[PDB]
């Protein structure tokens, strides 16, 4: 019984494809053998221990039932990206919602307050040294490789 959610679309058809994909069998119940199948079939993660630990962290499990198609409904979210990506992307993030881990010179000085360091001439000053890009080059993985990497500091 809905009451006024629009919700994401993309999402919520994806968990319907892979739940119907292993569960056409159409039983009507699901086991925490089927939840591995997709992620098992596609290859989304690595070990049964992401997908588990997620699934644990939601409350508890058991045997087989029906309930646990919340693997999916969940699946699209902690599979969703996060500071789990990066730390950086974390604190921008927060302010730019566009923050997709890369951004260029505009956005990087723009989201970077929200981190609250100051990116000034002398983070970009570095930047140039280990990623070797100028100021006028946008962020990418790399950038905060050589950020988190550099481990620097000066209000202390
Ligand atoms: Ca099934
Ligand atoms: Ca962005």
Do not use: W
């Amino acid at each position: 019984m809905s009451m006024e959610i629009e919700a994401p679309n993309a999402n919520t058809q994806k968990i319907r494809d892979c739940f119907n994909f292993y569960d056409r069998d159409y039983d009507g119940k699901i086991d925490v053998k089927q939840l591995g199948t997709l992620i098992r079939s596609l290859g989304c993660a690595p070990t049964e221990d992401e997908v588990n630990s997620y699934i644990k962290e939601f409350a508890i499990e058991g045997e087989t039932f029906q309930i646990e198609q919340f693997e999916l409904i969940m699946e699209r979210e902690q599979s969703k990206p996060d500071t789990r990506e990066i730390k950086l992307r974390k604190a921008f993030e927060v302010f730019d919602q566009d923050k997709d881990g890369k951004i260029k010179a505009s956005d990087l000085a723009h989201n970077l307050t929200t981190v609250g360091d100051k990116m000034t001439k002398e983070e970009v000053e570095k930047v140039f040294s280990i990623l070797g890009i100028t100021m006028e080059s946008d962020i990418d993985l790399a950038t905060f490789l050589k950020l988190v990497a550099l481990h620097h500091h000066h209000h202390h």
